[PDB]
Design a protein around this ligand. Structure first.
Ligand SMILES: Cc1cc2nc3c(=O)[nH]c(=O)nc-3n(C[C@H](O)[C@H](O)[C@H](O)COP(=O)(O)O)c2cc1C
Length: 344
């Protein structure tokens, strides 16, 4: 049956209700960036070295000082229990099995505590939105800290929700037996009521004083903004267009990655998400300077197939495709994945 990430998406389309599949699949508006996040990877070509000795390929690396088994981590995707009953709990258990990290959504269908208890040994980080209610915001950060989450990924590209046309057509909302457990399109209205469109760099200063955990700015697309995040004492940049779900017509993340890596001058780690489906995608992102990449939708499709096992399978497919891509390119470990491997 399912031997690559595209197969898991096709299976998911066959077994999820239309409104749930569409919520997970959609991009904003005409979905130009959604297509480009995938097409852009294909424009970057690989220049493999031969005869390097790849008997022993080591995929391990570090994210903000914490070891991971591979440079492929789970990105925040809201409300995972729509795809499968165990939702976030499963994801975290799969991450623990694989030895990689899970970024937990602020809009999870499982609590910060339920997920930590399910994956105590897993590397876990919290994705944060700055809520209008700063007491809501602080108690999410404090709960992450106490529960041995290792970083905060603050999403900075969502003052308002993007306009995902299928959610508006389907009048998206949660199934009746589910909730966000940490507290037109139903979700766009929720954002308008709950999430602060006023936040500025002053709020980043606030958050940077609030916690000693590492903080990564998620959703940066400009070098100037990245340099501002470094000036504010943040510890990494996640180059992201929110899975193409926010402003349509922004570039693909793999295309803006080199500007961001150049702008930060090695001062903080730079990560990528958006369109990662294949081991060669991971290799290209690392060659252009990313420390690791995050996967969003493939994880949801792993849930839709077979829950915890299905997330494990998706992660193992990515790991094996990445291993093969490294070996065929002449790379024994991630430290030798250099810029000459790629050209656009
Ligand atoms: C269904 C879905 C729900 C998402 N929920 C969140 C969220 O709660 N918080 C967040 O910061 N980003 C959210 N994102 C954006 C993802 O973190 C990530 O940037 C994006 O999925 C990466 O692209 P990919 O799906 O192509 O891998 C979501 C994306 C999707 C598809």
């Amino acid at each position: 049956r399912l031997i690559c990430i595209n197969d898991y998406e096709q299976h998911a389309k066959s077994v999820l209700p239309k409104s749930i599949y569409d919520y997970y699949r959609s991009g904003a508006n005409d979905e130009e960036t959604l297509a480009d996040n995938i097409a852009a990877f294909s424009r970057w070509k690989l220049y493999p070295r031969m005869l390097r000795n790849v008997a022993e390929t080591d995929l391990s690396t570090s994210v903000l000082g914490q070891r991971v088994s591979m440079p492929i981590c789970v990105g925040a995707t809201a409300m995972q229990r729509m795809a499968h009953v165990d939702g976030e709990l499963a994801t975290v258990r799969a991450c623990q099995s694989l030895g990689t990290g899970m970024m937990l959504s602020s809009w999870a269908t499982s609590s910060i505590e339920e997920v930590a208890e399910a994956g105590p040994e897993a590397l876990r980080w919290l994705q944060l939105y700055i809520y209008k209610d700063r007491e809501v915001t602080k108690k999410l950060v404090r709960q992450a800290e106490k529960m041995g989450y290792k970083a905060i990924f603050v999403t900075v590209d969502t003052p308002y929700l993007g306009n995902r046309l299928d959610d508006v057509r389907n009048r998206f909302k949660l199934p009746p037996q589910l909730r966000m457990k940490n507290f037109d399109s139903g979700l766009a209205a929720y954002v308008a009521k709950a999430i602060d469109p006023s936040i500025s760099w002053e709020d980043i200063k606030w958050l940077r004083r609030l916690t000693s955990l590492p903080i990564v700015a998620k959703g940066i697309l400009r070098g100037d903004d990245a340099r501002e995040a470094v000036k504010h004492g943040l510890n990494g940049i996640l180059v992201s267009n929110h899975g193409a779900r926010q402003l349509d017509g922004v570039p693909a993340t793999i295309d803006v990655l080199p500007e961001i890596v150049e702008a930060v001058e090695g001062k903080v780690e730079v990560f990528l998400d958006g369109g990662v489906r294949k081991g060669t995608d991971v290799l290209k992102a690392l060659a252009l300077g990313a420390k690791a990449v995050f996967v969003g939708r493939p994880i949801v499709w792993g849930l839709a197939f077979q829950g915890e096992k299905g997330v494990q399978d998706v992660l193992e497919i990515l790991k094996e495709e990445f291993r093969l891509a490294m070996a065929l390119s002449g790379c024994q470990n991630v430290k030798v994945i250099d810029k000459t491997l790629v050209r656009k």
